[PDB]
């Protein structure tokens, strides 16, 4: 019943020519609702979900202005970081930023975050108390000192506990039809002989939302991890997710195995067993 709003920002430098590639995406729980791609023609923050289209021109003009300001900040950061790390201007580098807020079932502030990374590694991150910073190395250290003097945390904290939560609640309300609905996974099992003596049982969970889910195999009532395979949760492409768990068993012994599916959309977990 808990929820969250998140923004992801990626900027990749292009030393050979031009400015960094900049891509921003916004999410409410597991639903992307906005996006900006410096490579796009519009040069505008664009809607990705129907319920955000309700927003008027002032909203789109404002989000566009701010997302562009973000891209420019990343542009400067790539330069600054290149200096901090005493790196050549010849190579392409990456900066990433993510921030957001979480609310509980009562839609009250639960926690906020703001993290940054350079070339795929942690650079600096706001502590959960939203009062301090976690700097990974000395380059981040100087950034940390700079941000303490400018009181960046104080400003972020107000956003995370104020505007962030306030708009998350607005979105959840405007997109209630999908955002406040859970899609329980559609489950079934498939049988795939691997030899005349062994067979693979695959337990499928499909078209579910949100993405969080747990698939577990049990053999005669007890969890089994050996001879099992769990693929990472993946998007179906229509807003929902998929996942499957498999176990190799001796042919003829299929009935000993059960697949257990846990998901927020299920009152109680589901149990599947091969016919």
């Amino acid at each position: 019943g808990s929820h969250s709003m998140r923004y992801f920002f990626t900027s990749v430098s292009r030393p050979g020519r031009g400015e960094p590639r900049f891509i921003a995406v916004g999410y409410v729980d597991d639903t992307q609702f906005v996006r900006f791609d410096s490579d796009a023609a519009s040069q505008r923050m664009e809607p990705r979900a129907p319920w955000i289209e309700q927003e008027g021109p002032e909203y789109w003009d404002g989000e566009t202005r701010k997302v562009k300001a973000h891209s420019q900040t990343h542009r400067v950061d790539l330069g600054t970081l290149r200096g901090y790390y005493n790196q050549s201007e010849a190579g392409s580098h990456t900066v990433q930023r993510m921030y957001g807020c979480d609310v509980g079932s009562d839609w009250r502030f639960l926690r906020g975050y703001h993290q940054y990374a350079y070339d795929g590694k942690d650079y600096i991150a706001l502590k959960e108390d939203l009062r301090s910073w976690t700097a990974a190395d000395m380059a981040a250290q100087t950034t940390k000192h700079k941000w303490e003097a400018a009181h960046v945390a104080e400003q972020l904290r107000a956003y995370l506990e104020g505007t962030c939560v306030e708009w998350l609640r607005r979105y959840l309300e405007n997109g209630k039809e999908t955002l406040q609905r859970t899609d329980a996974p559609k489950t079934h099992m498939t049988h795939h002989a691997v030899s005349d003596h062994e067979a693979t049982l695959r337990c499928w969970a499909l078209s579910f939302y949100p993405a969080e889910i747990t698939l577990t195999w049990q053999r005669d009532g007890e969890d089994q991890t050996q001879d099992t395979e769990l693929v990472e949760t993946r998007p179906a492409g229509d807003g929902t997710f998929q996942k499957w768990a498999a176990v190799v068993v001796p042919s003829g012994q299929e009935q000993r195995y059960t697949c257990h599916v846990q998901h927020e959309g299920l009152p109680k977990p589901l149990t599947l067993r091969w016919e």
Partner: peptide, 9 residues
């Protein structure tokens, strides 16, 4: 809704 400002590193 995005954060209004963004300080550089």
């Amino acid at each position: 809704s995005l954060y209004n400002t963004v300080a550089t590193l």
